[PDB]
Structures are given as structure tokens and as C-alpha cells.
Design a protein around this ligand. Structure first.
Ligand SMILES: Nc1nc2c(ncn2[C@@H]2O[C@H](COP(=O)(O)OP(=O)(O)O)[C@@H](O)[C@H]2O)c(=O)[nH]1
Lengths: 208, 427, 184, 96, 108
């Protein structure tokens, strides 16, 4: 017997979307205003600074690199990654003032739900928190705007079973990457980290 | 059962490996898509030795391809059996070497080493029992030689018990292809002597000689030469995959043929070989195979054993044949030519039998012997290298990569000791 | 099975290194994943079992639900990596009164009640790899007061990385063991 | 009863006309007679080609002669590759 | 009879051509009666399943037939009307160009 004839359920399209050509970091590099240059030493593509980091103005220059993470094409992508990582790790205490200004571009980058943008933002999440030994406790009020995307990809993982995993080098598995940043935030955030994280993502379990 | 992991460095090695997997796939009856469609149940007795299974009726070979430029990788994917290779196993760089041995060894070797070890660890741990790996590379080049030497040292460090079987192609003394060829072989040999358990030598000159001595083809291509090398490849490992009346493996071959640790460089040869039209005239029997194997024209290494002496010899057979006939043939060849065999080691010849012959061949055989004729090969490269080395100019390329100039003398001194070691064992 | 087999020294029941480690076990997955991967702490391949519902994701041995083990060794040794999450496992043994019992332990367990059917044990582990050793004969002799008979069934649940499950005839300390049968 | 059969057969035939099935299992298996016909044709072609190859000259070298030897060599290689392909007792093909 | 043992075995009831089904069914009923006369209950059950599947297939075949016929007739009507619409559109276009060519002559 039959009692209804209804619709079809949405076929889990959460990974396919991929836009292009968004950022504002382009226009500053489209005219040679960004003081970065590419060095083509054959070992690895390395970047060079037109302005030494000692005299760099962090409040205006750091947010621009965070904007470039949303880029899809090669040079802006590579310059954004290398510039962001270098500045965050070597800047030190000067980063803490730039957190309210760099969260918004990071929020925009995370909201794209792109296949490759989210891994870079997740790694940037890791490196931003470990700047000096502080500023992981300053992201607590920003959890309500940064973490909501991590719910989307939290439970996605590769189910194989007996098969040995082959992709561990170019580790792309979203579940393991999300878990790493959540442990890093939980260890670095402090006593109030777990309360806010558990409020945001109820699936997570403590590291205390 | 007892697995072997296959490694393909080198533009030469990749083509050799690609043809080798074509031969094995035809031998076992594996579709280019990896699905079994054969006719013999014996083909699935020990297919796990070379293949891993992907649920869904798909078998993936234990193949790892290494390079420094993606051009070779693109060519391999364009091949007929390119879908069989696992895409992730392809590991390659972006900055080539350009036949510069030092550049491949130091500059890109350090980067490529860390990554490639993870796949070699994965497949080594994806078997119930590992016997040894397998390396195919060229010596005159700069990518396969330098990187293979680095990976051979790393393989020895990580896996001491496992047998590191290496197959190499010696630069052609008369006409090979590069200005700088003596330098690459000079630095590669020192690493090969200490680490590799077994080294097999093949020369392109002998292959072209074999083509016009026996095959009578007009315009031979690299496909035929790679096919003969793959034929020797299959014959060496055949006894592991199929039963027989007298079984031998890489360990048994090493024990019998190697009397001393450094005397392990071997020559290879195959029989039967017959031109496309003369095969009707020939009556293929056990004595005919014995004549072809020991014949100098069929030897695929450019070193005449008659100029030297034999230390150990080994013969393997594929098909169904009388063991008495094989033993009699081995004894007769030993008594007839006593002027070539070392006096203090009797019964220098080994024998083995494999039940299943290859496709199309009713009877087949493979010969691996060790002789003092190898001293000519190192003498040739040393002679060419000597006047290369006295004119420092060409090494200045390798000096840029951080290589010390004293590295060349250490390698040359090692070859001189090896040549002397082969000399006094003749007496 | 193992009724016939000679049992002396060591008898391993699971090992992440090899072709098909789970070819001997049964796999049940709900709301989670089972994956085999390479762990950086030991630089060797290990099995991974993680799920949102620990009760609905486990591996059991032997495969066949009617058949039972015949492992004569009194000691079962577990080597697992703790993932700061809920963990549980159960072992089924036979008693001298011709009775069946199962010992399910849990880290989120609270009490240690010994009601006749199942026995519950709370335990606490340290972060990283552990070397839990459970003496089946001693536990049955001490807790239930009966006598121990050969092990029957083994089950391990999710939120852990397991690479070694073996039995020993007696308790061995460090280095009186094969070099593979210990932690790096 | 004939009238009932006519009604039943017509509607059955109309229904079957609309629903086809995929050819992944329906790929045609060649008959033994066709396989023998192809095999003997290839066998005769190979025998003729090798007979031509045997009928050549020593020492003769020129563009035409060496091109003839090249063509006959590759023709024989293709024919034997085809012969081995059709050597199997079961051949599944999708004819064009 | 070689076929009638196959639907007793599990034939799809579609591999049989439609002309054969009317001649199959009397044999299936008779063989089921023999198999239930002899004390053998499963042998009669498979025959019962085979005949019921044959009947269920043919009943819905009648129910499905006219639906396909109605769809086909409407489809050919739609194609016919579309072709007429395209011809009318061209006729309209030609008429408008004809009028404009006359108005321009009048204007000059
Ligand atoms: N036998 C054979 N050798 C080849 C083939 N293709 C390339 N080679 C060899 O590859 C060598 C050059 O190697 P190179 O370009 O430096 O790359 P490498 O092999 O990784 O060092 C030459 O000595 C060639 O003999 C082939 O198809 N067959």
C-alpha cells in the first residue's frame, strides 16, 4: 500500500562549489603596490620582500595578506600563503592588535566553503593562535563568527576500513585537519575555550 | 605469500618498468583496467606477490615511479597500461637534473627523499611478508643514477634484511649519449658496491648487436630492447610465482653465485632467440637452449667471457622437460670448457626448473653468470674518466652543487680496489 | 578454531602491519569511520576506529557469530593509542561451571558492579599509547570466584588506534619479548 | 480462447516495445563459425606474408627494398598480434 | 516443456516471447497439480509463484498499454503544431518587411 508521493532529498552537494576572482588584494598587486617578489631558485619557489619586515606597518599590511587567501589563481594564492605565514610567525606581539581587522577577511575566506580555501584558512587558524604564546585567548569572542563553518565539515571523513590510507603526505582529509585546529585552539584558548567551543560544536570532547 | 615492491626511477627505468608490467599482465591475464579475465587458475596462485587488490575486482601493481620532470610521467599515463598504475604512486619533482648527477643527488634528492619514503613504507607494510625490493635505473644519466644511489642507501638503512635487487644499464663505451657520462657512472658505482645486494649489468650496444645477430629486424626501436630486458626480468622472478620441479629464489641465486660480498655484479642472457622467419627451421630442445645461452652472441653484456674466467654460473628453465637432460647438459658444458672455469670451485653451474613457460614459447631458459670479464667495463670508464678528471672544467658544474672535488678520487680509488679484487681472484 | 592448534609462547590475534589486518575480524560501523593510516608518533601503519556513537562502532573476533575462540593462554595484552575520547571493550570467557560471561570495561564507567551476566570495570589511561595487560584467569578467580576456561570472544570499540592484540602464556616484562612485540 | 490470446499478445507486445535494456551484459558473443573464418583468413595472410619475406635477395640495399622488408616485418607483427587476440575460445565484442 | 521448467526455476517471465505465454500457462497449472498430488509442497509453491508472476505481469501490461498510446498521440500533435507555428512566424516576418518596403517608398 502507498500513502504519499513526495519530493526528493537534497543530494549532499556541500563539496562541489568553487567560485573565482573575488579579492581586493589583487588590485594592490595588480599595480605593483604589494612589496613582495618571487625568487625562482630551483629548489622551491621562494618569495622576497621589497620592504624589510622590521619597518613593515602591520595594521595595514597584514589584513591585505589575509584578504589574498580567498584568491584562486596561482601568484596571489602563493604570495598570500607565504606572506601570511611568514608575517604571523615572525611578527610576534604586533599581531595581537591586528586580530579584529584580520578576522573579517578570515571570516570571508572560511564562508566560501571551497575545497582548497578551507584547508589554508584552517592552517592559518593554527599559525595565528601560536603567534608568540598569546593571542589564542583573544580569539574567544571571535569563536561565534569563525567556528560556524567548521560544523559543516566536522563529521566528514574517509571510510575505508581494511585499506591502508595513501594520502597522508598531501593530507587533505578535512576531519583530521579540523580536529588538529580544534585541539590547538582548546589547548591554547584557556579555561573558557572549552565552554565556548562545546557551545558552538557540541560533538567535540575536551582536551583537559 | 612473499611480496616484492617494484621501484622505477629513471626515464629509462620507467619505460623498462612499463614494458615489464605489460609482459606480466599478458602472462597472468590481467586486463589493462586491472580486472582478471584469464583462463588458468594457476595465474591466481601467487598473484599477490606483485599486485594489491582494490575491492571491486581490481588489482593494482606494487609499482612506484620516481622522476624529476613530469614529462616522463605524462608519457607513462598516455600508455596503454597507464590506467593500471596507482595515481598517487607517481612522485616527481619540477626542477630537472639534465644528466647532471650531482644536481639530482644533492639538490633535489634531499627534497624527494623525505616524500617518497612514505609510499615505500606504505607498500612495504602492505604485505604479509616482504622478501626484497626491485630497482630499475640507468647509470649514464643524472636523475636515475644519483637519486637511485640515495634511495638505495636509505633502503639499506630502513630495511636491512630485505634484499635490494638492482638492475642497471652501463653507459655505452663506443657510442652513448652525453658529454659527461664517465662522471655519472664514477660516482654511482661507489654507492652501488656497498649497499646493493645484487646488481645486473646491461648494455645497449649488446642489444643492438643481438638485434642484428639474431632478430634480423631492419629498424629496431626502443620497444624491442625494452621487451628483451623485461623478458629477463620475468625469468628471474618466475620461480616465485609458479611451482616447479626444482625451485630457486633471489636468496638462493645470491647464495650460490656470490662467493664474496663485493663479487656480485652479474651478466644476463636469454634463450631461445630466433629471427622471425627462421623459427620454423629450428628444432627447440634442451641442448639447443644450452648452446644459445652459453654462446657469446646471445650474451647481452659487452664483455667477452673468453677474455676472462668464470667464477659461478646459473641456469633456469621454464616449461616441462626432463631433469636428467638438464643435469647432463650442465655437466657436459662444464667438462668440455674447463679452460674457462675456476679450478678451486667445482660444480660452478646451478640448475633450476619452472613448470609454466611463457606464452608462445614451448621451452625457455635464462642464464645468469658471474665472471672476471667485468674488469674490462670499469677499465673503459676509468680510461675515459682519467683525462676528463685531469681537465677540471666539466666538474665545475658539479662543484656548484656543493660536491667536494675529493669525492671523485674516493670513487675512483674504490673502482681501482674492485678491479684489483677481481684480478687476484682470477689467480 | 584454535582448538587444534599448538599454543605456546605468543599467539597474535590482530596486527595492523600486513596485507589485510581485519580479514580475521568483523566490522560494524554506524555514525563514524574505520580507517587504516600511518601514525606519525611511531612512523608505522596503524588501524583507526572513531565514531560519534562508541556503542555502535566496534570490531569483533571471530568473524562468524556462532563460532568461538579456543585461546588457551590466560593473558591478553592490548596495545592501543588513546584519543582523549570515550572508550570501551569487552572480552567473553567461559567458566568452570560451564557458563558464559563477558567483561565489558569503560572509561566513562562509574561503578564496578559484578552482576552475573556481565562484569563492568572502570579504567583510566594516559594520553598516547598504552600497554593494558588483563589477566583473565586472575580476574575470574578473584572477582567471580569460579575457575577460568579458554577465551571465547573479543570485541574492541571505537575512539582508539589499535595495532597489537596478542596473547601470552604468562606475564612478560620488558625485553623478554620479540623485538616486534613491544612499543617503539 | 483465440480472441483472448490476441488481446493478451497485443498489449504485451505494446508494453515490451517501450522498455529496452542496457548492453553491458548483452554484448554479443561471437559464434564459433565466425571465429574460425577470421582465424583461417589471418592464418592464410600470415603464411603468404612470411613466404614473401623468405623470397628476397642478399646484399641488395635500396630505399624500395629496405622499405619492402620494413613493411613486411610490421605486417607480420600485426597479423600475429591479431591471431593471438582471436586465439581465445570466447570473444566478446560490440559490433559497429 | 523445456521452458516450463525454467519459470518453475525462476525465469524472469519477460525472456519468454508473448506468443508463448498463453501456451505455457496450462502446462504450469497441470504440473503444479501433479506436484501437489504427490506429497511435495515446495514443488507446488514454486509453480504457484511462477504462474502468479505471469498473471501479475500481463495484468499491468494491459493497464500500462493505453497510457503509452495516449502519450504518443499527444506528442505527435505537439510536434505538428510547433511546425505550423514556425511557418506562421516566418509568414509574419515576411509580411512586416513587405509593408515597411512600401512605407519607405511612400515616404520618399
Ligand atoms: N634502453 C633504453 N634506454 C633509454 C630509453 N630511454 C632513455 N634511455 C636511457 O636514459 C639515459 C639518460 O637518462 P637521463 O635523461 O639522465 O634520465 P635518468 O635515466 O633518470 O638518469 C640514456 O643513457 C639512455 O640510454 C629506452 O627507451 N631504452
Amino acid at each position: 500500500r502507498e500513502v504519499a508521493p513526495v519530493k526528493r532529498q537534497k543530494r549532499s552537494l556541500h563539496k562541489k562549489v568553487s567560485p573565482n576572482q573575488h579579492t581586493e588584494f589583487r588590485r594592490f598587486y595588480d599595480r605593483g603596490d604589494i612589496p613582495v617578489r618571487l625568487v625562482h631558485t630551483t629548489f622551491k619557489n621562494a618569495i622576497a620582500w621589497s620592504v624589510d619586515p622590521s619597518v613593515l606597518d602591520y595594521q595595514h599590511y597584514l589584513p591585505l595578506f589575509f584578504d589574498g587567501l580567498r584568491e584562486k589563481e596561482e601568484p596571489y594564492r602563493f604570495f598570500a600563503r607565504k606572506g601570511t605565514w611568514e608575517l604571523l610567525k615572525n611578527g610576534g606581539t604586533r599581531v595581537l592588535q591586528c586580530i579584529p581587522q584580520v578576522v573579517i577577511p578570515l571570516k570571508k575566506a572560511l564562508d566560501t566553503r571551497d575545497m582548497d580555501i578551507v584547508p589554508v584558512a584552517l592552517r592559518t587558524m593554527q599559525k595565528l593562535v601560536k603567534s608568540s604564546e598569546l593571542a589564542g585567548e583573544a580569539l574567544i569572542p571571535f569563536y561565534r563568527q569563525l567556528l560556524p563553518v567548521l560544523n559543516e565539515f566536522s563529521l566528514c571523513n574517509k571510510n575505508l576500513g581494511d585499506r591502508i590510507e595513501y594520502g597522508q603526505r598531501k593530507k587533505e582529509n578535512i576531519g583530521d585537519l579540523i580536529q588538529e585546529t580544534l585541539e590547538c585552539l582548546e589547548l591554547n584558548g584557556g579555561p573558557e575555550a572549552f565552554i565556548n567551543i562545546q557551545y558552538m560544536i557540541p560533538t567535540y570532547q575536551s582536551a583537559k | 605469500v612473499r611480496e616484492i615492491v617494484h621501484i622505477q626511477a629513471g626515464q629509462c627505468g620507467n619505460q623498462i618498468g612499463a614494458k615489464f608490467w605489460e609482459v606480466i599482465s599478458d602472462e597472468h591475464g590481467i586486463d589493462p583496467t586491472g580486472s582478471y579475465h584469464g583462463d588458468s587458475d594457476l595465474q591466481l596462485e601467487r598473484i599477490n606477490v606483485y599486485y594489491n587488490e582494490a575491492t571491486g575486482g581490481k588489482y593494482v601493481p606494487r609499482a612506484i615511479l620516481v622522476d624529476l620532470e613530469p614529462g616522463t610521467m605524462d608519457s607513462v599515463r598516455a600508455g596503454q597500461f597507464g590506467q593500471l598504475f596507482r595515481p598517487d604512486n607517481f612522485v616527481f619533482g619540477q626542477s630537472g637534473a639534465g644528466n647532471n648527477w650531482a644536481k639530482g643527488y644533492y639538490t633535489e634528492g634531499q627534497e624527494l627523499c623525505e616524500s617518497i619514503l612514505d609510499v615505500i613504507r606504505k607498500e612495504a607494510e602492505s604485505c604479509d611478508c616482504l622478501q626484497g625490493f626491485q630497482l630499475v635505473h640507468s647509470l649514464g644519466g643524472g636523475t636515475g643514477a644519483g637519486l637511485g644511489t640515495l634511495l638505495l642507501n636509505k633502503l639499506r638503512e630502513e630495511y636491512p634484511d630485505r634484499i635490494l635487487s638492482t638492475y642497471s644499464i652501463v653507459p655505452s663505451p663506443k657510442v652513448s649519449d652525453t658529454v659527461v657520462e664517465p662522471y655519472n657512472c664514477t660516482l654511482s658505482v661507489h654507492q652501488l658496491v656497498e649497499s646493493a645486494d645484487e646488481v645486473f649489468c646491461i648494455d645497449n650496444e649488446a642489444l643492438y648487436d643481438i638485434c642484428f645477430r639474431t632478430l634480423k629486424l631492419t629498424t629496431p626501436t626502443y620497444g624491442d630492447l625494452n621487451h628483451l630486458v623485461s623478458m629477463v626480468m620475468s625469468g628471474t622472478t618466475c620461480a616465485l610465482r609458479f611451482p616447479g620441479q626444482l625451485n630457486s629464489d633471489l636468496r638462493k641465486l645470491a647464495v650460490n653465485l656470490v662467493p664474496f660480498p663485493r663479487l656480485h655484479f652479474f651478466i644476463v642472457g636469454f634463450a631461445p632467440l630466433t629471427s622471425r622467419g627462421s623459427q620454423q627451421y629450428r628444432a627447440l630442445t634442451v641442448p639447443e637452449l644450452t648452446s644459445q645461452l652459453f654462446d657469446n652472441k646471445n650474451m647481452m653484456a659487452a664483455c667477452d667471457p673468453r677474455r676472462g674466467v668464470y667464477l659461478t654460473a646459473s641456469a633456469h628453465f621454464r616449461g616441462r622437460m626432463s631433469s636428467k637432460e638438464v643435469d647432463e647438459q650442465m655437466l657436459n658444458i662444464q667438462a668440455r670448457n674447463t679452460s674457462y672455469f675456476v679450478e678451486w670451485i667445482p660444480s660452478n653451474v646451478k640448475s633450476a626448473i619452472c613448470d609454466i613457460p611463457p606464452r608462445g614459447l614451448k621451452m625457455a631458459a635464462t642464464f645468469i653468470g658471474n665472471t672476471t670479464a667485468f674488469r674490462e667495463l670499469f677499465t673503459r670508464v676509468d680510461s675515459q674518466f682519467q683525462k676528463m678528471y685531469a681537465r677540471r672544467a666539466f666538474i665545475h658544474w658539479y662543484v656548484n652543487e656543493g660536491l667536494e672535488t675529493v669525492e671523485f678520487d674516493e670513487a675512483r680509488s674504490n673502482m681501482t680496489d674492485l678491479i684489483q679484487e677481481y684480478e687476484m681472484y682470477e689467480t | 578454531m584454535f582448538r587444534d592448534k599448538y599454543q605456546a609462547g605468543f599467539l597474535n590475534l590482530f596486527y595492523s602491519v600486513g596485507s589485510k589486518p581485519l580479514s580475521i575480524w568483523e566490522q560494524h560501523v554506524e555514525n563514524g569511520y574505520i580507517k587504516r593510516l600511518t601514525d606519525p608518533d611511531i612512523r608505522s601503519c596503524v588501524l583507526e576506529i572513531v565514531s560519534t556513537t562508541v556503542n555502535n562502532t566496534y570490531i569483533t573476533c571471530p568473524i562468524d557469530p556462532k563460532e568461538e575462540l579456543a585461546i588457551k593462554l590466560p593473558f591478553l595484552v592490548l596495545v592501543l593509542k588513546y584519543l582523549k575520547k570515550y572508550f570501551t571493550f569487552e572480552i567473553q570467557v567461559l567458566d568452570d561451571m560451564n557458563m558464559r560471561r563477558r567483561f565489558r570495561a569503560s572509561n566513562f564507567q562509574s561503578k564496578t558492579r559484578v552482576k552475573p551476566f556481565v562484569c563492568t570495570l572502570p579504567m583510566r589511561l594516559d594520553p598516547g599509547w598504552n600497554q593494558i595487560q588483563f589477566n583473565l584467569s586472575d580476574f575470574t578467580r578473584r572477582a567471580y570466584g569460579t575457575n577460568y576456561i579458554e577465551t571465547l570472544r573479543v570485541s574492541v570499540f571505537a575512539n582508539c588506534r589499535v595495532r597489537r592484540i596478542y596473547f601470552s602464556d604468562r606475564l612478560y616484562t620488558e625485553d623478554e619479548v620479540p623485538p616486534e612485540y613491544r612499543l617503539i | 480462447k483465440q480472441e483472448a490470446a490476441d488481446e493478451a499478445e497485443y498489449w504485451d507486445n505494446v508494453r515490451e516495445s517501450m522498455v529496452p535494456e542496457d548492453t553491458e551484459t548483452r554484448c554479443r558473443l561471437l559464434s564459433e563459425e565466425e571465429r574460425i573464418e577470421i582465424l583461417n583468413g589471418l592464418y592464410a595472410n600470415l603464411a603468404e606474408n612470411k613466404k614473401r619475406y623468405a623470397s628476397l635477395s642478399f646484399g641488395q640495399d635500396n630505399l624500395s627494398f629496405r622499405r619492402k622488408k620494413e613493411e613486411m616485418e610490421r605486417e607480420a607483427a600485426q597479423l600475429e598480434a591479431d591471431i593471438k587476440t582471436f586465439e581465445r575460445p570466447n570473444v566478446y565484442i560490440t559490433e559497429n | 516443456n523445456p521452458t516450463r521448467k525454467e519459470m518453475a526455476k525462476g525465469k524472469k517471465t519477460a525472456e519468454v516471447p508473448p506468443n508463448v505465454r498463453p501456451k505455457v500457462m496450462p502446462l504450469l497449472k497441470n504440473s503444479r497439480s501433479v506436484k501437489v498430488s504427490r506429497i511435495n509442497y515446495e514443488s507446488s509453491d514454486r509453480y504457484d509463484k511462477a504462474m502468479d508472476q505471469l498473471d501479475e505481469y500481463q495484468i499491468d501490461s494491459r493497464r500500462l498499454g493505453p497510457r503509452f498510446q495516449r502519450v504518443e498521440a499527444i506528442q505527435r500533435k505537439l510536434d505538428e503544431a510547433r511546425m505550423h507555428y514556425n511557418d506562421v512566424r516566418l509568414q509574419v516576418h515576411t509580411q512586416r518587411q513587405q509593408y515597411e518596403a512600401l512605407e519607405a517608398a511612400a515616404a520618399e
